[PDB]
Amino acid sequence: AMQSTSNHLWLLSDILGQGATANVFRGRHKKTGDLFAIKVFNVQMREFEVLKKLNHKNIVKLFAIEEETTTRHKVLIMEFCPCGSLYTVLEEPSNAYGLPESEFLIVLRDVVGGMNHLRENGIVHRDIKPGNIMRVIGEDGQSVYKLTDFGAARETEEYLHPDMYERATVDLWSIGVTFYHAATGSLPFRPFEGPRRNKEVMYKIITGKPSGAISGVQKAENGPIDWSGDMPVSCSLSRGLQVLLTPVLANILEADQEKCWGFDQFFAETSDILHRMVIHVFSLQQMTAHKIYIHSYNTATIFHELVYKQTKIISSNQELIYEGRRLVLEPGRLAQHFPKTTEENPIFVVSREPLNTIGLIYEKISLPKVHPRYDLDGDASMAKAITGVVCYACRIASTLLLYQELMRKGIRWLIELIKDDYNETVHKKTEVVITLDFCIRNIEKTVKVEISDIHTKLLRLSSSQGTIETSLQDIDSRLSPGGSLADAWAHQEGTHPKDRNVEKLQVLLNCMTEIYYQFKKDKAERRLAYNEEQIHKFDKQKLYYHATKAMTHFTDECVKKYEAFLNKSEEWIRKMLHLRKQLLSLTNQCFDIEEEVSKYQEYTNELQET
């Protein structure tokens, strides 16, 4: 069967949504064949017309309105979103523990712009949720998010207000729940098992929320509630974004609506975050990657303060390396004039004073046990959770490999940087002995024409200078490829891209995703055949074997060699800082000596009787 209008037609199997006042399917155009969303509604045209006049990038554009053939049902033709809704995107195991940062900033940008455009024209939306946010591919390949379903008539639950759960600011609540869900991959207020079951406990978590906290989870049967005003360790965003995002959520999820943040200050603080640029920085001594969110007009002084807040490194000790060479940021240089940085090519921050080692902080997760009981909904949910765990193992393994590669590149540049400091001091020593060993014979040039006070002390300069000479060659001996500061252990420890460990985990991940997606098809068709049933259980045992092999290769290879590379890197960090301290001493001694040679080059020239 298929219904139609004057210009469109649509089957019934291609159904996307159904209500009591309208029914939404996908359909074509009789004259063009393009795909459109069709809301067959099953006076009121007043608000339909003013909604038809809208035109914004982040709004599902309501095209036209027509009449159906059989019944004169007033239908609405809308824009079709093949990629689905944000709720659909948050169910792919790649986003099980949070969206990527670039996609998260896209969501925050399009949602805020769409809501501002609705308040600007005076349209209210009660339940803003990931289901009401659609995804459409833009002309530049990047996702574009559009709003829909704002205006209906009736007769979710986890996104309601404490005033409303007993059955704008009230809508800003569902925004904070949506943004926490998109950033963490999970709901902020989770009772034990489904919130639909412990609906009475949900009211306890919402109204009894302490100020400043954003999360509350009950991890046991009738147990307690773990509160936190901080993002979980499994969050996909960087700490530079979490520090700017957390106060927004904490002050828009405020219980008493008298102290909600308000949309005006909300739109201002969000636009402040979106107008910022990102600068990738990598702490070589701490082995940590960072993303500094700074405005295009701030100075390098504020940049050093943000690096301090992420690393506890005093701005007076921050020394920067970029593309092999030094990087001196003037205290007034604007941020938009810095060198452009990526995750693969960041700015390296190092301090002359010793720093502790951290590495990568991730939450150790195990595999959940698979239930041999045949259950379409149970195995579909189990497959989703276990595939998201392997996705998390893929992301951590790729991050560990990037850390090791950035350590290898940063260490190489640091050694070639110390080499330049060495060749600078030798150039200065050779610049001052050219007058020391010269003026000492200028003295004896006058002797053959008391004075021993100069000689018996000037010889104490070359005495204290040859000690620097043998101390410089000892420093150079460590910079030799066989010295104590070798560069080969980085090529011997840890994992390399030629190992292709990330590709092996992604291959097992694609097999698990194929099985999970087939389980997603099985859950819909609530009954399977005998042969399809055996295939379902065969692939479930294959899910266990796939994830077991993935976790085994991850811990017994990716993690183990990473810990060995990091542990061997800490002793090289200590020895490197020891060499920089000695070289700085041998450097300043040449300066304190060159002022004495300049002091005695003129004392030997007395006044003459002329």
Ligand SMILES: CCOC(=O)c1cc2c(=O)c3cc(C(C)C)ccc3oc2nc1N
């Ligand atoms: C009332 C507003 O609803 C839309 O406007 C709209 C919605 C959707 C979808 O939820 C959708 C879902 C899927 C999967 C569940 C299979 C696939 C394609 C979809 O495409 C959509 N297009 C729309 N225009």
